[PDB]
Design a protein around this ligand. Structure first.
Ligand SMILES: *[C@@H]1O[C@H](CO)[C@@H](O[C@@H]2O[C@H](CO)[C@@H](O)[C@H](O)[C@H]2NC(C)=O)[C@H](O)[C@H]1NC(C)=O
Lengths: 214, 211, 189
């Protein structure tokens, strides 16, 4: 019953604008301190903004003049208007009711994702990580230069799951993502068994099956 | 005010007593909160006012401290307690957060198996060469991966990625990728990946010759 | 031709909590505002309207002296056109304020080991205070849609919080005694 449901996050270009919404049930937005807190990929938590029960607003310095927090009493909804977005603003954004010293941030939203990038949607290139010529053997697929996240990888249409490690994507200096998916198999199976990685990139509607062989 | 969490990560077993500390740079009396966060999930409030237990939070969590030194204690670690924990300053906008502490599953030392992969002929037609080095099923997480090209130590042209702890053997895997242009790739011969890890008596080097 | 009793305002043994701020009316006396300024013991002495050296050459019908204790970080809110927990919910100065604001560190008097919890402030309020408004109610703050019925709990918070003034606090969190002099003729220099 008590929940904060957020929406509005998405892909956007540097200098662009975006509006996040936080629809509340069980707490009264206009009666509370309401905060936005963000978390960049692989980083910690950072407070962004607050609006007081009495209407006063405050902002982190890196956000002043670009972000505007507001609320709608009729809809019991909190808003965050994000202008002049930069690549640094890429984060998961959380709304939360803030009790300060009397509690903490006790009610949190599920979070919404904001990606700020000048890169354009692009399906991946799948290259084989072919088994060495010279026990346990390793093979894999290099899923390179795609945007945006996410990419999902399976092996042999899901039949091969044991020993599979798919690594979290890294962001390259070009603005595109890249990841690898590896699997370890017995060296004896390289002659007999076929190994196909299946790469799925929904944002570009790309589906690739690559046979990896020695 | 700055908050310094120690340690960045710790490994523990079920039933252990776990202690995470937060050091404030000036003195904030009892204005401190502790949160728990699991991968992909929102933070969850555990303690506020340094020692007050949030309603519904299990009693094995407790906070202590006032002034500059604060402690979060889990008296008997349970399986669902493996996660990242954050301290937060209260009663101050621009509120300070701690850097976080990851509580990980302890196990015995396991050396990585090291594999190296040359770039595929297909990628070379694009004018870019990706050399990949794999460290599989190792513990603990700390590992050093040194790329060498014709025995020249490489810095600034490699990225690396680590999986979360495996759900069955509690080990890690790690990939390191060295990216070069095809022109730079063809100007050298020996590509080596050198791995340093606690489970290895001496560094392991896997290499290949271009061609 | 009697002296204005500033000594009993500035040198009071205890100060009020900011939410229940104290007001003393000053009338029918002569005031030396240049001994207050030239004491060199105040960390803040910012006058809005006229300089202190020049208002010693001035007369008003009444002078009000408001006093309380707040954090050092919150002294900036005791000024016209400010927002924050103190300016919004405890003590609000008008935009056209024409007096003086005086503050000094009182960590030696208002903090103690283990925390002095005498001093309170209002954390929750439905709306902002009007200038020179004093809200001293202890009604339970309804933060949700369910009424509170005068008992605390989820979404039902006691509106007043205690400062935890400890001597080891950072300076910005240490207690500061504040005196506000409002000028609106029985008071001269
Ligand atoms: C508050 O008390 C102080 C301390 O007595 C007063 O300042 C002193 O006044 C005496 C007598 O005039 C001087 O000998 C001291 O040099 C003053 N300073 C100190 C630090 O003692 C002060 O005047 C009183 N406040 C008011 C508003 O009258």
């Amino acid at each position: 019953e008590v929940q904060l449901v957020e929406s509005g996050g998405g892909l956007i270009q540097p200098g662009g604008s975006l509006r996040l919404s936080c629809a509340a049930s069980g707490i009264t937005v206009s009666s509370n301190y309401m905060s936005w807190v963000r978390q960049a990929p692989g980083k910690g938590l950072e407070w962004v903004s607050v609006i007081y029960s009495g209407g006063s607003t405050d902002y982190a310095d890196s956000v002043k003049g670009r972000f505007t927090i507001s609320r709608d009493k009729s809809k019991n909804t909190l808003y965050l208007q994000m202008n002049s977005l930069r690549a640094e603003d890429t984060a998961v954004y959380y709304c939360a009711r803030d009790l300060g010293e009397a509690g903490g941030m006790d009610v949190w939203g599920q979070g919404t994702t904001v990606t700020v990038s000048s890169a354009s949607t692009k399906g991946p290139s799948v290259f084989p990580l072919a088994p060495s010529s010279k026990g346990t053997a390793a093979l894999g697929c290099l899923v390179k230069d795609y945007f945006p996240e996410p990419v999902t990888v399976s092996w042999n249409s899901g039949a091969l799951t044991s020993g599979v490690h798919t690594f979290p994507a890294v962001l390259q200096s070009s603005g595109l993502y890249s990841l690898s998916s590896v699997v370890t198999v017995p060296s004896s199976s390289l002659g007999t068994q076929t190994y196909i990685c299946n790469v799925n990139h929904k944002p570009s509607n790309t589906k690739v099956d690559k046979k990896v062989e020695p | 005010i700055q908050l310094t969490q120690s340690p960045s990560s710790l490994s523990a077993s079920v039933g252990d007593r776990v202690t995470i500390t937060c050091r404030a740079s000036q003195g904030i009396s009892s204005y401190l909160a502790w949160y728990q966060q699991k991968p992909g999930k929102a933070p969850k409030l555990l303690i506020y006012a340094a020692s007050t237990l949030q309603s519904g939070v299990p009693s094995r969590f407790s906070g202590s401290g006032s002034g500059t030194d604060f402690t979060l204690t889990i008296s008997s670690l349970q399986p669902e307690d493996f996660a990242t924990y954050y301290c937060q300053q209260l009663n101050s906008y621009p509120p300070a957060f701690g850097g976080g502490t990851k509580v990980e599953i302890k196990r015995t030392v396991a050396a990585p198996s090291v594999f190296i992969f040359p770039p595929s002929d297909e990628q070379l037609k694009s004018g870019t060469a990706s050399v990949v080095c794999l460290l599989n099923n190792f513990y603990p997480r700390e590992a050093k991966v040194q790329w060498k090209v014709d025995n020249a130590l490489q810095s600034g042209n490699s990225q690396e990625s680590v999986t979360e702890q495996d759900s069955k053997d509690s080990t890690y895997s790690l990939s390191s990728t060295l990216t070069l242009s095809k022109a730079d790739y063809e100007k050298h011969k020996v590509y080596a990946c050198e791995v340093t890890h606690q489970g290895l008596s001496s560094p392991v080097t896997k290499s290949f010759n271009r061609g | 031709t009697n002296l204005c009793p500033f000594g009993e305002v500035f040198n009071a043994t205890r100060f009020a909590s900011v939410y229940a701020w104290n007001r003393k009316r000053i009338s029918n006396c002569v005031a030396d505002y240049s001994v207050l300024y030239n004491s060199a013991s105040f960390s803040t002495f910012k006058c809005y309207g006229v300089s202190p050296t020049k208002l010693n050459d001035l007369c008003f019908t009444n002078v009000y002296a408001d006093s309380f204790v707040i954090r050092g970080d919150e002294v900036r809110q005791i000024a016209p056109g400010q927002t924050g927990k103190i300016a919004d919910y405890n003590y609000k100065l008008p935009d056209d304020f024409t007096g003086c604001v005086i503050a000094w560190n009182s960590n030696n008097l208002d903090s103690k080991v283990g925390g002095n919890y005498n001093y309170l402030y209002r954390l929750f309020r439905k709306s902002n205070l009007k200038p020179f408004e004093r809200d001293i109610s202890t009604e339970i703050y309804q933060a949700g849609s369910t009424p509170c019925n005068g008992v605390e709990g989820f979404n039902c918070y006691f509106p007043l919080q205690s400062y935890g003034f400890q001597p080891t606090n950072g300076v910005g969190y240490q207690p500061y005694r504040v005196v506000v002099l409002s000028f609106e003729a029985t008071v001269c220099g």
